[PDB]
Amino acid sequence: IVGGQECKDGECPWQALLINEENEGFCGGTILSEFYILTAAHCLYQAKRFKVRVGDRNTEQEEGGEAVHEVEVVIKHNRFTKETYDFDIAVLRLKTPITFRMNVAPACLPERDWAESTLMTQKTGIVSGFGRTHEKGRQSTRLKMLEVPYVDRNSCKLSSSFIITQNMFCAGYDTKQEDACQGDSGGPHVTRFKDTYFVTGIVSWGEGCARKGKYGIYTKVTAFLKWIDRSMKT
């Protein structure tokens, strides 16, 4: 995350972190339930073997809330393509159930029509992660979050050098120096409604981070709510 602020105690409890064999975070995820994590399909090519950490806000210290979970099943959308990052969505079934606690709780899955008419027409959503704090920098050791305005679909397509499909939406800022970034990929985009936070996006791609006239591109979760529900049933 570029700009924004740290997640303070209890503020981003649905954040998950995919960690490689070296115990280094390379991608985010969203806790959907005690057994399931939502992530980006493209993240599944960034490590040979990985586990999921939850409850972590500061990767430099042991706060006591952290738990590492092994993955039992990786369910990648069969239409994912690396050329465009269309269908950039995957669900992970964990071997053991997540214990909810301070800093560890799921985000709500909304219903499609209501989310499209009511959540995605809100002014902003919130994106969070452990990724870089500047395009060229290192990963954050602190969990960060950022309010990101929803961006008009036309403007986003105008702005983009790569195709924006109907499985994507754009959020962030034209010129302001605030965006998701490398390592945030796969993480939560959530929208607050009456003090309840609903999954609306998965951090997917961008032309660098916080560049002028470029926006962040997110998987459109509302396009995949049936797919998610099916994946979680087995």
């Binding site: 209890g10 981003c12 800093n103 560890v104 799921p106 709500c108 219903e111 209501w114 936070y197």
Partner: protein, 52 residues
């Protein structure tokens, strides 16, 4: 601005228009309260709530 378009139909969470009437419902792990509008967490750590 009628029904669901008017302040989310007074619903805490999901609003649908059935016949010509607002119908509210809630995310999994919540139950709809007796007033048919509010959503009540069924147990600990309900989805979508920051932890206190």
């Amino acid at each position: 601005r009628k029904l669901c378009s008017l302040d989310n139909g007074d619903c805490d969470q999901f609003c649908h228009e059935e016949q010509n009437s607002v119908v509210c419902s809630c995310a999994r792990g919540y139950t709809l309260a007796d007033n048919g509008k509010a959503c009540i967490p069924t147990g600990p750590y309900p989805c979508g709530k920051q932890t206190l």
